[PDB]
Amino acid sequence: AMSLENVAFNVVNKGHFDGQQGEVPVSIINNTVYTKVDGVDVELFENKTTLPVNVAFELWAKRNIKPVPEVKILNNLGVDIAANTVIWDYKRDAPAHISTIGVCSMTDIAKKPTETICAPLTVFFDGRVDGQVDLFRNARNGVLITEGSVKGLQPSVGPKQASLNGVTLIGEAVKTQFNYYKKVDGVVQQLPETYFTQSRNLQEFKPRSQMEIDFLELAMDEFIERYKLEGYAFEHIVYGDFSHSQLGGLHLLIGLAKRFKESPFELEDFIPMDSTVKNYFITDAQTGSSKCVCSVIDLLLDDFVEIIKSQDLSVVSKVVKVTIDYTEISFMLWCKDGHVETFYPKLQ
Amino acid sequence: AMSLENVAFNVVNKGHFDGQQGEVPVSIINNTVYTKVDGVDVELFENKTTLPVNVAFELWAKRNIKPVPEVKILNNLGVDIAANTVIWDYKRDAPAHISTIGVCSMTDIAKKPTETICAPLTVFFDGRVDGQVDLFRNARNGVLITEGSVKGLQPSVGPKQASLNGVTLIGEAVKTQFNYYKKVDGVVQQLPETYFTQSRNLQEFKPRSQMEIDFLELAMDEFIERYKLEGYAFEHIVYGDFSHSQLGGLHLLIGLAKRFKESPFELEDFIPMDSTVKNYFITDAQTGSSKCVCSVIDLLLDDFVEIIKSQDLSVVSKVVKVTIDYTEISFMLWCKDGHVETFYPKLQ
Amino acid sequence: AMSLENVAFNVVNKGHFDGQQGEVPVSIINNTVYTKVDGVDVELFENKTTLPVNVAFELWAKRNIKPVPEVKILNNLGVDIAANTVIWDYKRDAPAHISTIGVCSMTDIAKKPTETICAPLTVFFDGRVDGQVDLFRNARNGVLITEGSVKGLQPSVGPKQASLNGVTLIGEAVKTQFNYYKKVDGVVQQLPETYFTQSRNLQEFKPRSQMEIDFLELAMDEFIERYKLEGYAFEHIVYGDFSHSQLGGLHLLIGLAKRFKESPFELEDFIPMDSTVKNYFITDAQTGSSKCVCSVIDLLLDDFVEIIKSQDLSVVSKVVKVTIDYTEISFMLWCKDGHVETFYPKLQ
Amino acid sequence: AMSLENVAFNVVNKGHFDGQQGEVPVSIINNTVYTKVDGVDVELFENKTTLPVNVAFELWAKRNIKPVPEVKILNNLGVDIAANTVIWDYKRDAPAHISTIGVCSMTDIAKKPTETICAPLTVFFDGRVDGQVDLFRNARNGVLITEGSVKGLQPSVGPKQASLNGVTLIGEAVKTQFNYYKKVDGVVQQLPETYFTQSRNLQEFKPRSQMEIDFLELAMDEFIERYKLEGYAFEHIVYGDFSHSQLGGLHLLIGLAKRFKESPFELEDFIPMDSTVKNYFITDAQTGSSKCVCSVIDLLLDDFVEIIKSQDLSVVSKVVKVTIDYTEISFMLWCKDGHVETFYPKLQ
Amino acid sequence: AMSLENVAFNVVNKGHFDGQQGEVPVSIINNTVYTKVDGVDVELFENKTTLPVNVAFELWAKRNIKPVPEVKILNNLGVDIAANTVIWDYKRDAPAHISTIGVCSMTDIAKKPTETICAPLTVFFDGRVDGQVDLFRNARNGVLITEGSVKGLQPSVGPKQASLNGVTLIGEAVKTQFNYYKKVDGVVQQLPETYFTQSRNLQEFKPRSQMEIDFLELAMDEFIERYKLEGYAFEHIVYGDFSHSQLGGLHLLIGLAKRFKESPFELEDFIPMDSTVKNYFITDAQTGSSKCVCSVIDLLLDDFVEIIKSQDLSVVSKVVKVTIDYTEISFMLWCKDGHVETFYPKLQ
Structure with a gap:
């Protein structure tokens, strides 16, 4: 049920992609997306990436809007790809990772991180999402963030700050300090x-x-x-x-x-x-x-x-x-x- | 439910828009529409119009693929817009008409030719489509083509030739000679x-x-x-x-x-x-x-x-x-x- | 050194990339590569691919100019990448494969087919090039073409025709009929x-x-x-x-x-x-x-x-x-x- | 008053620039010039040069439409620029010369070839145009073509063929064989x-x-x-x-x-x-x-x-x-x- | 080495062009220059000039990074071109001058200011660069700046301020007040x-x-x-x-x-x-x-x-x-x- 008009409907009505049903008329001119609002064209997105305008738009709309690790941390941990989400890089105005897992037809290399192609890649997992901790347990290569303790795993206390919609902050109303876990070739590493x-x-x-x-x-x-x-x-x-x-x-x-x-x-x-x-x-x-x-x-x-x-x-x-x-x-x-x-x- | 991915699915599978369900991954780069076929990008459409690439693509896919009057005839008869179809101008590689009726969300001025906005416009009606002859009878301004006689209406025998997918021909397997009828301000005109x-x-x-x-x-x-x-x-x-x-x-x-x-x-x-x-x-x-x-x-x-x-x-x-x-x-x-x-x- | 100006020099002087030294002044406007010849700009290449103009230009210049298998054959055999060459696809006016091995800095996933990343990919090997038959022997997944018999392996006689600069022909002055060999997970297959x-x-x-x-x-x-x-x-x-x-x-x-x-x-x-x-x-x-x-x-x-x-x-x-x-x-x-x-x- | 709308009016009405007064509505999208004809956009020119679209359009409209020397001849004689005309290079789909004299505001280096800047340049003259033979006589560096003899000057008989609107031909209704003359640093040179x-x-x-x-x-x-x-x-x-x-x-x-x-x-x-x-x-x-x-x-x-x-x-x-x-x-x-x-x- | 990849290497490693050996992979999309840094594309330059993207990029990388006269001073003095450097115009985000001398293959009109073509042009010379004072002495038309006295030449004390990387300032650690000298047709002028x-x-x-x-x-x-x-x-x-x-x-x-x-x-x-x-x-x-x-x-x-x-x-x-x-x-x-x-x- 993936469509450019549905992605745009979600941006217009929800501020981002929220998996809601509906469509809005869209125009693609240059590297810009427009939608109609009472007879006039309104710019929704300007593509500053090297990806096609329509794919960049979908990835941006599907960005993670909860506090997430800064991409400097994900680069330093040798993170290659994210499991069923998009980490938007606000410094580059582009997705942090080249490919996706279960996000977008144009960039997906798989639908699930359990697929063969994903095994040699260091997959990012978010413990705040249902089943992701278990996916990390089955993953060959991966990096995990949690808000709390995970059974049998020694944690590494991360930075106090995280990025929320391009705002780096130390959360008071929300948790930004995460526990970090890493696996390499099926073995859990000591950070x-x-x-x-x-x-x-x-x-x-x-x-x-x-x-x-x-x-x-x-x-x-x-x-x-x-x-x-x-x-x-x-x-x-x-x-x-x-x-x-x-x-x-x-x-x-x-x-x-x-x-x-x-x-x-x-x-x-x-x-x-x-x-x-x-x-x-x-x-x-x-x-x-x-x-x-x-x-x-x-x-x-x-x-x-x-x-x-x-x-x-x-x-x-x-x-x-x-x-x-x-x-x-x-x-x-x-x-x-x-x-x-x-x-x-x-x-x- | 209009979607770029559904339009492209129909083009890839049916050669044009055929109202079938399904989606294909699409990339928009410059004024060109691509789709991914076995990991590589395949060009489906190059925009040669003044309309946005994605809009032009949808109108082209939804073009009339039955024998239709040559554009010069429609222009000479003062046709402004078509009822629930797209007359593709193969000489200009663009839609013959600026706006549409019940075709595309970005170009539609109406869903049905009965709408007020259509009344001053000369609407093209195709008698080969169910109910279009009756729509012509209710239309203030319009041009109608039929393959046969219509009750109470005196016909004008048109050219022997018509356009079929940009091919001007005198039909032997298909009918290309139409009866023409025209209405101005509610009154049937003698052509x-x-x-x-x-x-x-x-x-x-x-x-x-x-x-x-x-x-x-x-x-x-x-x-x-x-x-x-x-x-x-x-x-x-x-x-x-x-x-x-x-x-x-x-x-x-x-x-x-x-x-x-x-x-x-x-x-x-x-x-x-x-x-x-x-x-x-x-x-x-x-x-x-x-x-x-x-x-x-x-x-x-x-x-x-x-x-x-x-x-x-x-x-x-x-x-x-x-x-x-x-x-x-x-x-x-x-x-x-x-x-x-x-x-x-x-x-x- | 790999340079846009050197690639263009080779094209202007030799028709394609050879490995001679020299540079020519280059202009990149839109998706077109130009060079200055006696004060005026000459178009060398128009990009019709989804890759950046300069990247597509280098891949095109570095295309194999000897008779090569037609793309449909390579696709049907499951070829994912070529070893130290570019198979240009003249039907799409784009490279046949996404990535390269020892060809171009922007598209290379390796410099050598012996690298880890290449192991799960079916690499295309040309027996007419020194050491490629042996590289096939060391490869996990691959497809090999030869002009003559390969010691031990029963050959599969390929089509009579091959592609030479986008010209599909049955060679009389050159060999266009190749022997085909295929390897899956280190085991030679019977075609x-x-x-x-x-x-x-x-x-x-x-x-x-x-x-x-x-x-x-x-x-x-x-x-x-x-x-x-x-x-x-x-x-x-x-x-x-x-x-x-x-x-x-x-x-x-x-x-x-x-x-x-x-x-x-x-x-x-x-x-x-x-x-x-x-x-x-x-x-x-x-x-x-x-x-x-x-x-x-x-x-x-x-x-x-x-x-x-x-x-x-x-x-x-x-x-x-x-x-x-x-x-x-x-x-x-x-x-x-x-x-x-x-x-x-x-x-x- | 030189204008984009006037240049186009002349193309729509005369097929090229003819110095007629009038204007037509124009649209510039990408590198393409369109004009509105009965509510629909008609492509007049597609820019294939490295000059801006509007500039290229004016130069093309103002091209010489009489038989002219082939570009290879002009290049071999070291012609740098034309006097009060544009030699269109149909092989490159671009003006033969970068700069102009009394033609276009954007490319003009002079209004008259007598200007100081022109002195070191070999400016081309056409004896078929009133006053051009005399301009050549006052020119420091130049190349002159005539249909007939010129007072006190030895001619060089040129090729039998010339270019007429991109058609190289030996004229029967028109003269294509010209007499050639050169001057280098004020002195007439024997070709x-x-x-x-x-x-x-x-x-x-x-x-x-x-x-x-x-x-x-x-x-x-x-x-x-x-x-x-x-x-x-x-x-x-x-x-x-x-x-x-x-x-x-x-x-x-x-x-x-x-x-x-x-x-x-x-x-x-x-x-x-x-x-x-x-x-x-x-x-x-x-x-x-x-x-x-x-x-x-x-x-x-x-x-x-x-x-x-x-x-x-x-x-x-x-x-x-x-x-x-x-x-x-x-x-x-x-x-x-x-x-x-x-x-x-x-x-x- | 005079290459796009070398220019980009210099920018990435030295912050500007420094004549160092090396190459980085580059992508040119639209009017933007990108480099691959750890698998992701990083924007290095966005072309805001009327020159081709790659030309503008080289010209910007090779800009003068020492305190230089503001563009309005140079324009007022009738400066047409600069000797073996690029004066970047930060107000227009473009080079101050159309052509160059010994800078860039695409824009150079000469390699040395002593060339014939340069004689009628007012060349800008920087006394802080070895041999430039002498080049001014041999120049027909020129403008010279120095930090100190030049034997035989009466100076004109310039503004207290100068531009350093787009910052106009009165230098305390660096000299920003220059002596100005000008010559027309070989004769030194009194400013x-x-x-x-x-x-x-x-x-x-x-x-x-x-x-x-x-x-x-x-x-x-x-x-x-x-x-x-x-x-x-x-x-x-x-x-x-x-x-x-x-x-x-x-x-x-x-x-x-x-x-x-x-x-x-x-x-x-x-x-x-x-x-x-x-x-x-x-x-x-x-x-x-x-x-x-x-x-x-x-x-x-x-x-x-x-x-x-x-x-x-x-x-x-x-x-x-x-x-x-x-x-x-x-x-x-x-x-x-x-x-x-x-x-x-x-x-x-």
């Missing part, structure tokens, strides 16, 4: 101890600890002496150096957040996608100090404190591997005369 | 006595009389002598004059057909549509003689001879009006010393 | 005894036997007489019945070819793709006889005669299965009084 | 003695000498015997060798013409543009013999015989330079034991 | 004494003098009294009249910037491009006062005061010419009773 990125933005930044509040308030000198971290190069790494043409350091989001409020700047997101580490072309509107590739991570300041604190401070050049969002991130631990010169995410 | 164009092509030209057979096989001199056409300027009008840079006469299709077998030429159809009189930009390959606007009509040679021989040849110039395909066609008749100089469809 | 379709066209129809020559010159009667096919309903099945509004029989290409010489007709290829049995919407220009779905097969007349003469005519209706192009084709055989009434490819 | 290509087609080939008539009628052996061409490898060069997988010779159009009538083949024009030497990807339907880049020239057989018989047969390999269509064409001459092995247009 | 527009925005308007701090904080009456501007019509010219249906005056940005803080309004930029004087369709949200064409200039208030105080107030109407951004701006000065009535940029 590693990890830090999580905080997924905040520049324009409306929110501190999530006293140290973060203190960072945003206290001056450079006062903060460094208060939380005691003299030789860890916070002046360069976190605060940033704008004295030269080539902008120095500034690899922590909170640092960008502090600079933004006093003096704004331009961030060019030349690779627009959700990732644990982001690369931007930054131009400071105040000094004219710029950097083409500025790698930025949003870690809780306390976590970054703990991370920098915990290192060697010996070898002139080094690589440190930290577990962030279940994946391993490399950092260039440069050193000279026994103190931190810089610390930043690895590029080449 | 005029008319000649009909023969709707033939240059490549597969077929004579339809002994005189036409004689025209194609005999030489210019003998034909003119045999049929006593001496002062009627057929040398110019029909045979054409290729001696000067501007091509002279050549306004009868049979004349173009005769020339074509001898030496080919180019015909630029700069207004591509069905019309009683066609205008072409002609270039003769052998001589280089050309004409920007060469008006061409396909009349049975016998009819053209009857027309020209019915004229008074006493005036230098005069406008001659002839009813053809139910419309009044104006010709320019130029005479000198009691003989014809030229005779051509008037363009000014 | 069935099969008939092959002749892959001819209506316009340039060439008889391939004396019977076919006689069919085309002799009259229906004289031909039925000569070959004694009185109770085999050739009048209906092969010649076709144009006496009613719906076209009777006409399921053999040679039949269509015979009628075409006499009187032309329209064939609407509503599913444009290579298939053993083709379905057309046919309209006879002379009679007006038509049929929405007319299933047409191009069998050598001698083979069709052998097929029909091999059947039992004791039952009113029965399903007849014939191996054609390595696939099982179902026919509907209708009898009455020990003679054939009709025989046609089954669809319902 | 070289040259051969001219005949610009004929495969499907409608016409011999233009007794030797050409003899070539088409006589068998290979007796033609070579009659014209004493024994050691000139005509069997290879002209007739072509179809015995091997790679196509042997076949570099003369007349040779292709002779083969085609006997047995057809396919010619892929992978660089679609007008040039003295054309490159095609050829596949012989009978044998399967093919060649990726088969360079073809249409020389009068008598001219080709004169060329080949004028060569010294003493060296194994040598470059032969021939002036054709005012340009120097390089050929490769291979000899053995005092007889020619092969001869062909050089590419690498 | 005129000029005022410069301050290139500010309404949103984040920053005063650059005490008079400007005051304009923004004091009330209209207090400000005019403090700076003794009584008969200079500042109420009309710099504050604007919102009492009538048509907006009065408001031709200074600071004025718009002062209103905006109080009450917002709409500015329709119907000619979106960089220009010394901008025209907007302004609608005041509070009053409903509007003006279709409101000419706005960003002069430092002190400069505007100096300009208006330098005028003779004896004539009713008068044209006032002021050199701004190296160009002559015409103003329309209206006086009555020895006081200013209005003063505005003249449009005709």
